[PDB]
Amino acid sequence: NKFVRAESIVAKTLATSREKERIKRVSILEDKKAKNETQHIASGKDFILKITEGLIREKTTYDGKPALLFIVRVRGPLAVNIPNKAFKILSLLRLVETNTGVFVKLTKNVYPLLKVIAPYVVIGKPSLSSIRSLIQKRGRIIYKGENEAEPHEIVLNDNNIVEEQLGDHGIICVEDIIHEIATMGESFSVCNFFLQPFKLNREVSGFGSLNRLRKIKQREAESRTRQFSNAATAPVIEVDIDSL
Amino acid sequence: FITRSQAVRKLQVSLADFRRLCIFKGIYPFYYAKDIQYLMHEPVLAKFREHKTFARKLTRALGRGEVSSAKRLEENRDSYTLDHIIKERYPSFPDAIRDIDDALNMLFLFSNLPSTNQVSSKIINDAQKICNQWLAYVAKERLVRKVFVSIKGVYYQANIKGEEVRWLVPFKFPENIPSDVDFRIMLTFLEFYSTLLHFVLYKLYTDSGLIYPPKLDLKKDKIISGLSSYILESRYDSPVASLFSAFVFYVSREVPIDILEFLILSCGGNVISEAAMDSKVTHQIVDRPVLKNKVAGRTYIQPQWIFDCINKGELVPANKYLPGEALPPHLSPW
Amino acid sequence: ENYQYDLWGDSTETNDHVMHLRAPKLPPPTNEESYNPPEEYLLSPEEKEAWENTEYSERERNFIPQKYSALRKVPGYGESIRERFERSLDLYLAPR
Amino acid sequence: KVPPTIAQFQYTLDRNTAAETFKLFNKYRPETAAEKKERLTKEAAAVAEGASPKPYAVKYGLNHVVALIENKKAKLVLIANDVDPIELVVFLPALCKKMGVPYAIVKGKARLGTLVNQKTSAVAALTEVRAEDEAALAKLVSTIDANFADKYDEVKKHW
């Protein structure tokens, strides 16, 4: 209900001007890449940057191979309001909430949409322990409560709940869900919308003495370990998810 | 004797910090006069005062706007150690192993916790590291006697220097944290039990076993992050420690692995998982009503057989443990 | 190198020399409440609500005894943090 | 009852302008005693084994400042109202008016101290400035001359 300062209200527009123009620019080059009308554009292919840990920036081209990614929500950049093209993709991936993860497969259709949301998300190919520990530590299931209430999201406590909701697809237990998530199979689209999103805790998680300084240290570590390319030939920044 | 109020006032210390010292020192209630009167001269109390000075002198730096001096205050910061606090609490090693009963119950719970704004990830990762060190040693020198799987979790019994410790491990599912519980009391218990476990594990490894601390293989921790990872280098007496020798078990996907592979490696068997993919195998452990493959080479078991073979020690017949039939009533070892 | 030295060594001295050291009593060994119990332990439907009617801490079991056919069918026990927290409180707040 | 040259204070700079002043001023922090020391130990490490430009930071001693106003080195001057002896500064807003040097009474004597590594300051002034912020300064100045010098032309009068 508070008063809104003038400086903020101009800053929001001045940042969304950059974001609307940026998203339209990436939209044009990706549309012209698919239609095979590569006559006069910047680049007609796709690079992926893999930054690891003393910070080595790799430059490797994206293969046609389907890969497994774990997209993590960030909150960035500062004054930006999300446009229509961001509302759409982040609704489809169900990542409206900050500090929230999801699994998706990466193909030649998935990769153009990844460039749009790249200032809002941090991506990367996880390992078997990252997946397995994540599911056995966090997990939600939206299903009916006692008798009347529907919107209860509780916890992956049981395996008989897994039976009742999935069952006939071949899935019986939580470890079988981990199997169809780690290895790309038939039941992946079944169980991916079953664990809807994950609820990752935020970094540092406080405003105070130690926590402000630790947030300062990490906030300056952000712009080093992540860059906003803003160009239509933006290389997709992949980071270590085992470390994250 | 003295009242709580009179103890707090005499120490000139906050109630929280009075209770923190009370947790560390092992003091319990009316308190004993000579007990509080003995707490007064102690390095930990002085270090709590030093933390309070540091707290304001940091917010002085932060509140002004200077960041470099605040970052420098972190560098010039020492912390309280709970080293000498155990020598006066558990002077002998067999006395510390009499406490490790309650110590390993907190620590194995705190491994199976999602990190919140109450409890940082560093806290849970260090606790899980100690848990994995404990599991690795007990599976190394072969010191298990009894197992008991309950609704609550899975109980173990272990002759650690011949005094039978008991400890509980919960099931590897997400745990619903209530807002009712106080994660400031439990953090100090963790803080005391953690250091206690570091010193116990150094004593155990450097006496009879191995180098401390052992390393961990990075691409093994990427696969399991459990017990088949974390390789440990060096430089029997009980029937349970002689069981499962020259047996190779193929643990399937369906069963929990980390609660079961500990037991196989402890007794003398070998583990190949379904999970690791994502020969010599003589038994398969499967929990499905319909089993698919059915080869002539393997023997098919529901894990209850392992949970009875450890308790008896005499290798119970697998005729009452086939996949698809109802298990025997599973009695406690107590 | 943190906490990487032996502190006990050749340590024979016991702390139970003054009669005022009340040893913290290791909790009672678990008696017949497993994931697969003999189903006479499985509680009658009347006492399922009567147990829930009784006030906490003046109660024989902190749990309902339950039967499970499979080991995969064993739920994650929700009231587990509550049990360790209450034991922790029992150590430094309950008079010995 | 207040004589006009006293409580030429209390009619300080407004909220939005004030923050923007510090927006500029916190850019021109003097090095801290810790920082200065490490810098030189960095030099000693280097210069014991194997060029620099003059560094802009704001100016902060009452002396140093009263030197700087009247010598034209000063561009902007910040003067805190609440001071133990008020007399220690009462002349200062007039001196500046007379040398035509842009000045603003800021609120919070401690608030000046922030921008300068000290407990208080009474007065700080930005003499010389970086190339990029040169424009930022001269505009701020104008902003100050509007909302402070022109707004309070009657600060020299009225009790």
Side-chain angles (χ1 to χ4, degrees), chain A residues 5 7, chain D residues 15-16:
Chain A
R5 308 281 292 279
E7 313 105 350
Chain D
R15 174 249 183 255
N16 184 72

Side-chain angles (χ1 to χ4, degrees), chain B residues 102-117:
Chain B
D102 198 73
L104 286 157
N105 223 314
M106 275 275 166
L107 225 129
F108 271 93
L109 178 128
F110 268 95
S111 67
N112 195 10
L113 248 78
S115 59
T116 55
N117 44 19

